[model samples]
Target: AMLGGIEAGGTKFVCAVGREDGTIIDRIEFPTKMPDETIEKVIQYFSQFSLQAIGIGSFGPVDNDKTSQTYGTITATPKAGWRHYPFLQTVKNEMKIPVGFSTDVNAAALGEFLFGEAKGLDSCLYITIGTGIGAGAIVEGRLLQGLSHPEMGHIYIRRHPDDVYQGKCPYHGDCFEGLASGPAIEARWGKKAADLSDIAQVWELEGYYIAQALAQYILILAPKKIILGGGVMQQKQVFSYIYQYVPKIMNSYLDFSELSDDISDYIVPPRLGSNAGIIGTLVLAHQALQAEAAS
Candidate 1:
């Protein structure tokens, strides 16, 4: 049976219909207006399809605990009218269909595992460096959800040696995202990554900050691979610089051969490209369908 998928982003929502294998048969993209207005579009688009279930990979802070009264609701977020919005409940009521939900980065990680770079691996981490930095880990064929979900990006980072700018995070001033996210780059360099291609120091510092986080994850999670994606990773050169810094940060600490020698295989971009989130939404839809059937 056909399924519906929603990439419920802060700025744009990509509503799609797809098969069990995550092939998006057709899709629609629209700006996220307000809860009522935007979700209406999602319903309108998917109503035409006789779908089994709908899955939403959403931009968060969200309440993912299935037992919580606010489960599937977007918790406190600064996005205009979305704070505490009953995202999943509203849709469930309207469509009367089973739904699967998770953070967008987690969806991306599943996409890579099922269809892209991390395929067949025991585990992998997906990090997105954009207006913000967020990460999701897939281990043992499941997205790692501890308390609610991993807020890996907000961890404190040891500041770069040459970095003098105060980070921009409203909560943690110099946390990982505040220091290394796209806006952080623009705030520190007076230009975005797209325009600062000629500056060597820019990437070096960015790489160092990024490497700190990677190094931490390596030591703790020890994922088989780490896929770096999102808007800032588009620079491509930053990946090369990450190759240089991550090893130095570790400094012969771990005995693992993959970490000891080859960083390329250990770290990579999403092979599914930007479609990872949307494609993974299809996978979630599939999960919901099966879960509903079995239950």
Candidate 2:
């Protein structure tokens, strides 16, 4: 009864309670605040529920490998207030519940694999393109966990030949986040993406980069589905654009049957929508409880 999960993002924290069927029964959302203040809020919420165990799907770079001292702590985040913060330990200390931890996107992929469209697929990739861009992949039914989790956002992409706009990431200028995230779009075009109806060049360029990344992911990981989410992806027109662009970028070098159909269906919006994060968090909590009992 006390199974719950937390999807902690840079901008907000989403908490939820649910069953394995993926129906989130109750939930809460709060703006991410200062460490002590933010964490106090989390503790108060979970304490009331007396959750048996919780799972945390958080923004990274975090230590997912248990061999390290910094495991489960936020690292080198643009959010200066929470850099190296003790996310897992704090929750454990306050609630005394076994907390399963993973990157936010990984949790989303798991949620989809367990309950959504990708339910039957043993492998899938989930990407969120918003304030920042990040990805998580599930391979052979296990979330890909190797050497500090996947920071797939920063992977290099060839710039659109005709377009040249410097990236927005403070750490890596012109990286994906620097080039195409919400802030990057605003900074480059001098208005919100929603305000600019003529985002052909902008979104086209974005699709190129994303498709290139997806192409690489396809060759290497061979995921059956790629779920794209986040506020930026609300522009539903992208599916058409990516369909045309991804094939062009790959240029017949990668021969896969799925490529013949525009690949839009293969690379599309999350069926679970915005709830992927919260639902994934709930799934995480359920798994943590199950793991604890097994142990």
Candidate 3:
């Protein structure tokens, strides 16, 4: 049986129907419009398929508590027309299929855990540095869910020494998103990253702040792998810079053997590539199906 998945991002929604192995058979993309319009597009996308279950990874602050009346709903978000909308419940009521849901970052991390590069590893962190910043961590095997998931991206970090631009976050200026996310890069530099090349200095400052956060996560979560994704991370220099700076910030604290090799393996790209979020949502659907079957 097919499973349905939705990666409901702030900018666009990627909807797919697929199997447990992350092989997406069909998909569609649409801008995130009003709740009704967006939900209509989602229903239309999977109309042809007999999905046994559906999963959604959405932009948040959202409620993931399955027991709550508003579970799988976005809450008080800046994204117009979606604040407090019941995303999963809408789909569940429409399709009459049990649904699984999580934040977009959480879904991406779950994808990494089940079928991506982080597979076989017990724990990892997935950070997306796109239009906004969000991080998802898998501790042991389950997605990190407590106090409404990790809002790691908006937390404050020390400012880079040579940089002095007013931060760009709508909620928390100068937070991690304000400093190094794709929007921040454009805001600080005056053009898209694709337009600007030879930006070793820019990436250095970016890595400076990012590595700072990675070091703190390492000290706290101690993930087995750290996978960085989203448009900003696609910059090749970012990997190199982070590979160098993360260890520099750590200062060789632990005598752990893995730290001896290239931290490149430690900090890497999404193994599922761009499919991370969508495929991860499918995994959630599959899990929901299993749970329903058991019940």
Candidate 4:
């Protein structure tokens, strides 16, 4: 059956139609604005398709609690005009079809789990090193969420002694995201990451922060694979730094094969590339259709 997906990101919006095998039939992209306009555009784009169901993977802090009165609502996000927006309900009411919803990262993880690097694995963590660091994980064959989704990017990290950038987060001054995100790196350096490629120290420091966070995630979640994506990861040098530092950060407390083996295979880029999110929303759409059929 045909399906459709809406990936509502902060910077932009994308809508597409596809099938369960991760094939995108067609897609459209636009800038993100007020949810009213954004979702309308989504509905318009999807209207041409004979969609069996739909999926929405949005920039979050969304209400993921299925039992909550406002399930699938985007809540308390820094993105204005979207606070308390009932995202999933609106689509279901309009399209009269089963709908699935998740954070864009979670959906991406699902996409990878279904058809990408983590396809055959039992568990993996997907981290986006972007404007702000965010993570989603699939574990024991399910997306990991409790109370709400993970704010892994905000976890605390000890500072590097050689550096003193005073961190960027409005909340946790020295947290992982405050130190390693694109905004953090941009604030510390005069230019954007795209321009800083010749600077080895930049990737080194970024890897230092990334290494600590990855070690922490490994210690806790112990995912079988780790996938890193987002704008910063495009630099290509960041990976070696992650490989170099994570072991040092761990300090051999948990000597396991995944940690001791070739870190490259263990840490990889998204197989779906930029398409991960849309393909992910397709995964959600397929899941929703199956869930509805089951019931």
Candidate 5:
């Protein structure tokens, strides 16, 4: 039987029905409007499928703690109408299936670790740089979750001397996401990354800020591989520059060959491309099914 997955992103929601082996059978995509409207569409789409369970990889800060009374709720997001929305409850009440939920980047990390570039790795980080920046990390083959999830995007990084543009993030004017995200690139350069590929200077500063944050993650979490994805990562140049700068910033810290001799392989792109989150969500559904059986 098929399981349902929802990549509930800030820009859009991708709903899919897939097998336990992570093969997506069908999908629907639509712009995220409001909680009531978007989720209703999600329910309607999945209603056609004979699903055993459903998983949601949602844009957050959300309530991912399953023990909490409010687990599966979207909490404190600046997105207009979604704050404190009971996303999981609505889905569970409507669908009456075992539902699993997590932040979008976390699901991406899980997918990559299980089936993508980081397959077989016990520790890895997945960073998505697009409308905003976020990270999901797996350490010792377990998803990293704490007081909440990692807000790697909001960490502060020293400004590139050549950069003077006020960042685009409304919360932290010059944090990592504020400086290095796609909107930040456009706001600073007056054009989208696609239009500015020829401008080497744009990527230089972008790489520096990104590498700076990455360097911190390396020191703290020491992930074996770091997979970078999302809209801004489509540039390709960003990857090259990040590979160049990360070592310079690390300056022979750990001396892993993955970092020194094989930076390209260590800091890589998502092998599953855009499908990582959706597939990861399906994995979450599988987890829920197993958990229910165990119970």
Candidate 6:
């Protein structure tokens, strides 16, 4: 049976239809404008497919608590026109199919765990550093969701000595997302990350902040692998900086081979690339289908 997936972000929405074997059959992508306009496009595209179920991986702070009355609603996001938006209900009411919803990063984490870089691992963490920074973790074969999904992005980070940019997150002045996300890179360096290839300091600062966060995750979750994604991570130099800096930040607290012997293999890019979120949404759809069957 075909499953439908949506990777909804602050910048754009990627919707796709895929098979049980994880082959993406069709896709549509467009800029995220107003909710009505963007969701209309989503509903219209999926309307053409006879999907068994659909899943959504959306930019959040969303109400992912399934028991909450507001479950699946986007809440308190800086993105205009999305606050308290009943995203999942809108899609479910329109499509009349089994649907699953989660934070985009959590979905990406599931994608990596099931088929991408973290395949075969018992635990994994996926972090995306783009227009915003967010992280999702899988522990003991389950996506980590509590109180709500992990909001690792807003965690505080130490200021770089030479950096003076106040931060871009409307909520947290110098949090990890405010300091290391793509918008943070652009606002700090006065140019886009893709445009500033020659600036060594940018990657240095970016890697330090990112590695700091990874260090914390390593100590806490000790994930088998860390998959980094999003537009800012497209810069290959940042990878080198992160690989070099993460261990030093950890100060050899964990004596694992992945950390001591081969950090390169541990901290890696997403194998599924930009498709991780949508593909993960399909995984969610499959889970929803199985849950419905069991019920």
Each prediction's whole-model lDDT (CA): 0.89, 0.81, 0.87, 0.89, 0.90, 0.89
In order of listing, the candidates' clash counts read: 0, 4, 0, 0, 0, 0
* lDDT by residue (tens digit), candidate 5, 125-197: 9999999999999988889999998889999998888789888888989999999999999989899888899
Pairwise TM-score winner, candidates 5 and 6: 5
Q: Give a tens-digit lDDT track for model 3, residues 134-161.
A: 9999988988888688899988888977
Candidate 5 worst ten-residue window by lDDT: 72-81
- Candidate 3 displacement at residue 88 in angstroms: 1.3
lDDT-best of 2 and 6:
6
* Model 2 lDDT, full chain set: 0.81
Alpha-carbon shift of residue 98 in model 6 (angstroms): 0.2
TM-score of each: 0.97, 0.95, 0.97, 0.97, 0.98, 0.97
What does candidate 3 score on TM?
0.97
Count steric clashes of candidate 4.
0
RMSD, model 4, all Cα superposed? 1.0
lDDT of 1 by residue, 183-267 (tens): 9999998997888988888888888899999999998899998999999888888888898888888998887767757788889
Model 1 scores worst on lDDT over the 10 consecutive residues at 253-262
Per-residue lDDT of model 2, residues 138-223, tens digit only: 88888898866888888777777776688888888977778778888888888998886576776776777777777777777878
lDDT of 4 at 115: 91
Best by TM-score: 5
Shift in Å, residue 7, candidate 6: 1.0
Question: Runs in model 1 with CA error above 4 Å?
Answer: none
lDDT of 6: 0.89
Angstrom error of the Cα, residue 278, model 3: value is: 0.4
| Total residue pair clashes for candidate 6 | 0
Model 1 error, position 259 (Å): 1.3
